[PDB]
Design a protein around this ligand. Structure first.
Ligand code: ZN
Ligand code: ZN
Ligand code: ZN
Ligand code: ZN
Ligand code: ZN
Ligand code: ZN
Length: 195
């Protein structure tokens, strides 16, 4: 009986660690996905308000609300969990994005690795994804509050391409979450056998 118990306990300890690794990972991934959805919603609203703008004091008011959206998106781009920025890669000394869209985060991604070898990017350099999001929102807000109508059609298209960038990331992140959820279900089925 003792010999069998060595094997069952060894496996059970690997399973426990993997369960914690999956729980930790799903928290970072959920936060990431929720932040991305919050950005998608913001850019959607920015698009809508810019259509209104394209369709004197009132163009400026639209410009104002786009400014609130710019602030919300900068807040969202600076989301931090477990000591690191999810869109600021491997440095957390500074906020990774300014209100101007300048990136001051870490150059490299931070990888996490499950007990069984599976690796994913937990904290990423988000400059290419979010710097242009923010820069576009900023030019949108200024174009509107300065009554600059000619600038708006270009910026509408810029925001559409930026949003497609955020949608594709949301989808990649959804996929990683689905994988984690499959790993959990596999481990649960394996736990039942052991016990
Ligand atoms: Zn062991
Ligand atoms: Zn936390
Ligand atoms: Zn320091
Ligand atoms: Zn590796
Ligand atoms: Zn999901
Ligand atoms: Zn779950």
């Amino acid at each position: 009986a003792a010999s069998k118990s060595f094997a069952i306990q060894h496996s059970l300890a690997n399973m426990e660690q993997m369960q914690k690794d999956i729980a930790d990972s799903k928290n970072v991934l959920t936060q990431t996905e929720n932040t991305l959805q919050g950005v998608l919603k913001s850019l959607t609203r920015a698009d809508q308000l810019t259509v209104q703008a394209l369709n004197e004091k009132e163009l400026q008011a639209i410009g104002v609300e786009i400014d609130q959206i710019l602030k919300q998106v900068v807040y969202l781009a600076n989301t931090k969990e477990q000591g690191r920025y999810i869109f600021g890669g491997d440095s957390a000394e500074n906020l990774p994005f300014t209100e101007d869209g300048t990136y001051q985060g870490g150059k490299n991604d931070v990888n996490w690795k499950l007990n069984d070898g599976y690796e994913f990017k937990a904290f990423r350099n988000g400059e290419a994804l979010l710097s242009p999001v923010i820069k576009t929102l900023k030019q949108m807000s200024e174009a509107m509050q300065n009554g600059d109508q000619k600038a708006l059609k270009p910026l509408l298209e810029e925001n559409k391409q930026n949003l497609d960038g955020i949608i594709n990331r949301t989808t990649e992140v959804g996929s990683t979450m689905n994988t984690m959820e499959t790993f959990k279900t596999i481990l649960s089925e394996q736990n039942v056998a052991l016990q």
